[PDB]
Write a protein that binds this ligand. Structure first.
Ligand SMILES: Cc1cc2c(cc1C)N(C(=O)C[C@@](O)(CF)C(=O)O)c1c([nH]c(=O)[nH]c1=O)N2C[C@H](O)[C@H](O)[C@H](O)COP(=O)(O)O
Ligand SMILES: Cc1cc2c(cc1C)N(C(=O)C[C@@](O)(CF)C(=O)O)c1c([nH]c(=O)[nH]c1=O)N2C[C@H](O)[C@H](O)[C@H](O)COP(=O)(O)O
Ligand SMILES: Cc1cc2c(cc1C)N(C(=O)C[C@@](O)(CF)C(=O)O)c1c([nH]c(=O)[nH]c1=O)N2C[C@H](O)[C@H](O)[C@H](O)COP(=O)(O)O
Ligand SMILES: Cc1cc2c(cc1C)N(C(=O)C[C@@](O)(CF)C(=O)O)c1c([nH]c(=O)[nH]c1=O)N2C[C@H](O)[C@H](O)[C@H](O)COP(=O)(O)O
Lengths: 331, 331, 331, 331
């Protein structure tokens, strides 16, 4: 595999159509799904030359841990849909690559099993109709050694997935929510979580500048600027189009991550240059899992690592901090 | 049917080609027809998160009536072209859905019959060469219980419909103007109508900011920002491209509706976020009528209602007023 | 024929390929040829409503004559290439339609014969290596009753026509320059012409704002803002993209015409709304000539007249002056 | 051959696929490769009319030599890949056309042999792991009569060429680096070179404005604003998009060249109008070499010369300096 695009072809071959569609699809007309890609394609980097590259490092410190790349595996529900080892395969590969892995509320293997893999994982929370259930998940995650709570705030309910409707998609009997519905979360829910844990709380799905500011005021340790991979509001702006404005508004008050459409080390560089602390990567990790299990995810992460190093050095950046100081131009 | 686009395919199957073309077509090269779609596709919504969605309501108050959605059925002439029950089928479905229905001057069933369906309908006026005929229609409409006069101001004569010319299109003998030519309307005509009725007068086909301002000065209760679905001046700007500027200029002095290319609840949200009080929907209602009569229109309206509710909540809006305060970004 | 595009198809059928290519083609990669169309397609008109249209008139006064439309036939060399009656057929149709016809220096029928048709024609001048020959043409044109000298200033030599090169195109033996090489014209040449005639001198091929200003200072009665239909500098800006800036800079000091890509009455309206006094139309007139001779050109001009009237009225303009006060929006 | 595009077709026919791909390809997704073309296509020239063109000259003075055109042959490694005479064929044609030829560090014929061809050549330097080797090349180049050192600064290592990876591309045994690895160059390396030679040092691969300024401060005689033909950082801005800003910032302190996507005399004109002193041309010279050896390159250079003269005169420019004063408009 020489690009992330090689793996999508491989995953389409192996997966049942309705499962590939559950993975690939977005809401509505898939306008936001396509825009996530279009938005990255319009960004060009202005590289610097003639800088010292004797010790190029792609490492970052985030939420109290060193990570090997400015990247984490996005929360993707029900990974046993894609490979029988599901979340364990992905978590093992992430651990070995030094990349944080986000354990999902809707994981198909229990959060404690995935945490036991090691690698200092994060935990993604959905707010549930029974509040105590959500707060119990938080405490479970913390007890199991998760290092951040990624509170997904853009799912008061699931978006309208027309592929899933047309396919009549449902989970196979062999895939379940192993940690066991959606309730709208509010700012009150955020405070309840913040009071229940000393872990950093990261709000995922922020697109409005004022919501980013309020996240900082609320004590969030980070935000993920995200339209949920085009799966929630169809017509929601891409995160990458809001990122610079949001970075400016928070002015270092929390970590600002982005996701949606990251498909190369060059895309990571673009996100960094627009001010991201790190990115999340979703669909490509699942392509790799479907194509070749743990080894597939390993190969994907090694490829991404090489592409990030390559892009950084070609752009004159010996560190991720330097990459954040790069300028960009829209084309 | 899971999207409005499902119904267009269904209508193309059933309708005679020349009738589908009368419905689908625009004037000239259809530049304005296509631009109505392009303009909506370029708008992205910046959703809000973490707001109370315990009682999301899509209702509005407009022209003294509660409506279930920020939407009305656009005036479309000669609905018996599309289904034998024509306007009665559409009016019944609109009534049952709590959506205003606009009875046309060129309706193929008499305005009194359509009004008797109930549902507090509106009446669309064309100015005719014989002025007294136009004012008589106004009084007929008012006597029959119509609640607003939608004065269409963008048809001094019919635009050049090249599909209709190429097809040699003419009304079948079985379709007539049941209320029984065009004269240019002027501001004087508007005043004559305003003096003849206490109903709100709504000027449909306004695109210039100064004309919106003058509409308010003239005592209009509303305007519809509209290029007549691309059927009149070919090269006329889409209403959606003028809407924000017009909303700012009238500064609450009348209701500001928009139409042209609305094809989903997400499109309704975009229009609302740009400042519209409500939208009109034309072609899709006729697709539904052609495909399945009254039940087809019912299904379309239920689908639109669900999509509007979905989009609003995903965008953090518990009310249409909140949706009007959303920001947008061009992509 | 219901659009100008109908006639292109008809002309392609009848003409020999190399002649159609001489007509259709541009220089280089045809970037400027395509951009002339793209530029018009991006312009949208903001129409006005509710204005008095009791006596819509498309007439203008220009260079001391009333014209039926804000349009003239562009200078196109060697019209016998397209039909045996060549320039006489086109001039007769233009006369009958009340549209000025521009007689070319490279006409395939003598300028005196074409002038004898009537219709108060214009004469297009090329500066020739022998200066006295150019000034003799001016005097011939004036003696024959031409009413303006259209001095083409964008042909110091012919552009690189790759279609003509690839085809090995040459004039048939039966087509000649009946008035009988290129020398670069300069501002000195303009003054020589201005001193030799009391007719208005119109400089055709102006694109720079400073050149438009200088044209006024030089005593020009008009300019044609033009990239020569994409046939001269490949990569030259379309005239329509410079027109508004040029109109502002000359501030009524001369007539400002535009050409390039005008294919409908709506396009005429766009040009007018951007500030043009009138347009020239080239290729479509030749399509009509090729398709059906004099009657073809008559039908084209009647179609254009109807489209101009239609567009003007739909846009709320009872006169061309009103159309010039319309606003536009780029899409 | 009537355009540069004719020669690409010819080269594709003759070359082995993997060699054509080594030539044509870029890094990553080839975003920067495509953008080099897109960027030029969006630029339109505003030509001037009515200027004296009695003695149009395309000559420039650069780095102490007159050149026949504002153009040089870009450094392209391993020219024996494309034709058996390789660099000697290209250098001979360049000499005869009065165009500078850039001898590569990775030339497949020794720099002394290519210099012996004559034509006052330039020498392109890569910084090598063994510094003394790089400085020895500089002295060799100077001793052999090269007139400028083009220090390529955008290759700390080779970009990721997915075509080459997929093809398993390697040099044939019959092609070698005849002057005999990459080390990142720094500003210190630039100073070492500047101290080692009195020849002008030209830094190739500058895209950031601050790096252009620093180049002047460092004593560079020129820069080449360049993304290395889209072969290095995928997502790097095209040079043509940075050129105007860079020209303004250096404010005559060094020569500013550009490359990437130059495919015609019109493109040369665009670059000049944006402020370039001269351009480099890469791939097209290799197409000509592959298609027809020395004579092919001769024909290409004669074609480019004619296109440059044509474009300049059509734009009203009797000199390259005049062309630099042309204005442009984005379309
Ligand atoms: C591809 C994908 C994504 C999600 C999920 C599944 C699949 C298959 N999640 C869910 O499916 C949960 C949900 O069932 C809720 F309605 C859904 O979206 O279908 C998943 C999710 N984000 C998140 O916070 N939790 C989730 O569990 N997401 C969103 C991701 O975290 C992330 O924002 C996107 O993958 C980023 O875009 P990419 O990198 O894919 O372009
Ligand atoms: C699709 C369609 C629309 C009209 C009509 C017919 C058909 C088939 N009307 C007419 O046909 C009248 C007319 O014969 C006059 F020349 C014509 O346009 O053909 C119709 C009309 N608008 C209006 O105010 N009265 C009409 O009667 N319109 C315009 C609509 O009210 C409305 O502006 C558009 O449907 C909005 O765009 P959509 O929602 O279709 O994208
Ligand atoms: C289509 C066409 C145009 C010309 C000419 C021929 C043909 C076939 N003329 C010439 O061919 C002269 C010339 O041989 C000189 F090099 C050439 O362009 O080939 C013609 C001409 N404009 C002009 O002022 N005199 C000409 O004689 N032009 C340019 C036109 O006046 C006018 O600017 C364009 O037709 C406007 O674009 P359109 O309306 O075609 O989009
Ligand atoms: C087409 C091409 C270009 C290079 C080279 C080879 C080939 C086949 N060079 C190299 O291949 C060296 C290298 O092996 C290093 F990694 C590579 O790019 O593959 C070549 C080079 N530029 C340069 O300064 N030295 C080189 O030797 N370049 C870049 C060119 O100097 C120049 O910047 C581009 O050709 C400009 O774009 P074009 O005019 O091609 O659109």
């Amino acid at each position: 595999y020489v690009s992330l695009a090689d793996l999508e072809r491989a995953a389409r071959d192996v997966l049942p159509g309705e499962i590939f569609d559950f993975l690939a699809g977005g809401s509505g007309t898939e306008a936001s799904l396509v825009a996530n890609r279009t938005a990255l394609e319009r960004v060009f980097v202005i590289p610097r030359m003639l800088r010292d590259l004797t010790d190029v490092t792609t490492e970052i410190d985030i939420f109290g841990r060193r990570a090997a790349l400015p990247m984490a595996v996005a929360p993707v529900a029900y990974q046993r849909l894609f490979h029988p080892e599901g979340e364990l395969a992905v978590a093992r590969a992430a651990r070995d690559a030094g990349v944080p892995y986000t354990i999902c509320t809707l994981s198909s293997v229990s959060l404690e099993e995935i945490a036991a893999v090691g690698g200092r994982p994060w935990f993604q929370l959905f707010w549930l109709r029974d509040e105590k259930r959500s707060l119990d998940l938080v405490r479970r995650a913390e007890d199991a050694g998760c290092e951040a709570i990624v509170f997904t705030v853009d799912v008061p309910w699931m978006g309208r997935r027309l592929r899933d409707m047309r396919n009549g998609f449902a989970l196979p009997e062999w895939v379940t929510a192993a940690n066991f519905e959606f309730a709208p979360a509010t700012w009150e829910s955020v405070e309840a979580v913040r009071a229940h844990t000393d872990l950093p709380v990261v709000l995922k799905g922020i697109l409005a500048v004022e919501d980013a500011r309020r996240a900082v005021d609320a004590g969030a340790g980070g935000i993920v600027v995200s339209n949920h991979g085009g799966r929630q509001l169809d017509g929601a702006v891409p995160g990458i189009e809001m990122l610079g404005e949001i970075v400016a508004a928070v002015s270092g008050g929390c970590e600002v991550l982005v996701d949606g459409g990251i498909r190369s080390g060059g895309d990571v560089l673009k996100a960094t240059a627009l001010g991201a602390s790190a990115v999340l990567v979703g669909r490509p990790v699942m392509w790799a899992l479907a194509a070749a299990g743990q080894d597939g995810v390993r190969q994907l992460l090694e490829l991404l690592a090489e592409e990030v190093r390559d892009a950084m050095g070609l752009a004159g950046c010996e560190s991720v901090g330097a990459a954040r100081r790069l300028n960009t131009k829209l084309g």
